[PDB]
Amino acid sequence: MVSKGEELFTGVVPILVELDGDVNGHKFSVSGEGEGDATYGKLTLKFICTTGKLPVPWPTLVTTFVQCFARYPDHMRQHDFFKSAMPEGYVQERTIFFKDDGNYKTRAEVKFEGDTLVNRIELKGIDFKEDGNILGHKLEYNYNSHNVYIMADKQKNGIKVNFKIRHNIEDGSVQLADHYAQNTPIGDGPVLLPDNHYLSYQSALSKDPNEKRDHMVLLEFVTAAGITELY
Numbered sequence: 001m002v003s004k005g006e007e008l009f010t011g012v013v014p015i016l017v018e019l020d021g022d023v024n025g026h027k028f029s030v031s032g033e034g035e036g037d038a039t040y041g042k043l044t045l046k047f048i049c050t051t052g053k054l055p056v057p058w059p060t061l062v063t064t065f066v067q068c069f070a071r072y073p074d075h076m077r078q079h080d081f082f083k084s085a086m087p088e089g090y091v092q093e094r095t096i097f098f099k100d101d102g103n104y105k106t107r108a109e110v111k112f113e114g115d116t117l118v119n120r121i122e123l124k125g126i127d128f129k130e131d132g133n134i135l136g137h138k139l140e141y142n143y144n145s146h147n148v149y150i151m152a153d154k155q156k157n158g159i160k161v162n163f164k165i166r167h168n169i170e171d172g173s174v175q176l177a178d179h180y181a182q183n184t185p186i187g188d189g190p191v192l193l194p195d196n197h198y199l200s201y202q203s204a205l206s207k208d209p210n211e212k213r214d215h216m217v218l219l220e221f222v223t224a225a226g227i228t229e230l231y
Contacts, residue, residue, distance in 0.1 A: 005083040008112065009038035009068065015045060016118045017065055023125030024102065024135065026055035032065060034218075036117060038083070041071030041222045049214040056125070057139040058216040059167055062203055063179060064094070064106050066119045070199055070222040079194035079227065081150075081159050081183065087112040088187030090158070099176040102128030111186060133167075133175045140168040143203040152193040158184040159194065197226035 017032030034045035047058075047065060054061075068082035082090065089111025096104040108121040128135050148163045161181040166174045185191050199222050206217045 003084065005086040006077070006080070008086050009036075009083055011039075012037045013069075014116050015043070015066060016113075016116050017045065017047065017121070018118070019061070019064065019121040019123060021056075021123040021125070023056055023104070023123070024128045024130065026135070027051070028055055030054070030061070030065075032119075036066060036069035038069045038071060041069065043069055043218065043220040043222070045218045045220075046208065046211075047216045047218070048211075052214070054214050056134050057137055057141075057167070059139055059141065059143055059205065060096075060098075060104075060134060060177065061123075061216075062143060062205070062218065062220075063096070063165060063177075064104070064108070064121055064123060065218065066110060066117060067092075067183075067199070067222070068110060068117065070224050072224045076197065076224050076227050078192060079197055079224070081192050081194055082110075084190075084192035085185040085187070088185065088189065090183050090185050092181060092183045094179055094181040097178040097180075098128075098134060099178065101132045101134055101175070102126055109186065133169055138170050139175060140170055141205055142168055143205055144168075145200070145202040148199045148201060149196070150194060150198060151196050153182065154193050156182065156184060157191065157193070158182060195227060197224055199224055 013036050019030040021028045028051045032045050032047040072080040092108040094106045104125045106123045153160045163179050165177040202221050204219045
């Protein structure tokens, strides 16, 4: 049988992203729009800094900017926490530790508002070096592919996730961003608590040649795997 949560994602869904941020007192806001196609695990989003120049590098916000759009193949349909929490939604909390620099703490509420899937985020960053790789804008505008490891936290009626991003610094080096996350349902209804598995990510960053505001165009694909004889 197809669950309610699953059914909400059977076609293309419009997405709205909202972020209010404050990094070392540098305040900024971002809005994003686009759409998600969970059948293909496909996100197409464009973000605008509505407060002027973004005070951190766009790539450092990629992971923050809707895991309900991951492609869960049929055989893994019992392990899709994210869709099972819909439409009421879930809250994602992360801490992102930038090695030898500051940290971001984020809280994102992911829920439907009518037909639109909303990702509403508050981001707080502290302890950054004002001339470091983040506040000094020394990161390249590119992105690596990654696997992301998901485990149940049954005790907390949710999931925990940990992974590493390795941002490319303009000198050929690496700025590690260690991610730790918890996702919890907003509502009181049952959710699917998964066996251990992972999500496989690829991300491409680009620019709109007709856009004069500070912005990022993101194309991202996300597929679940790690659970698998018929052959």
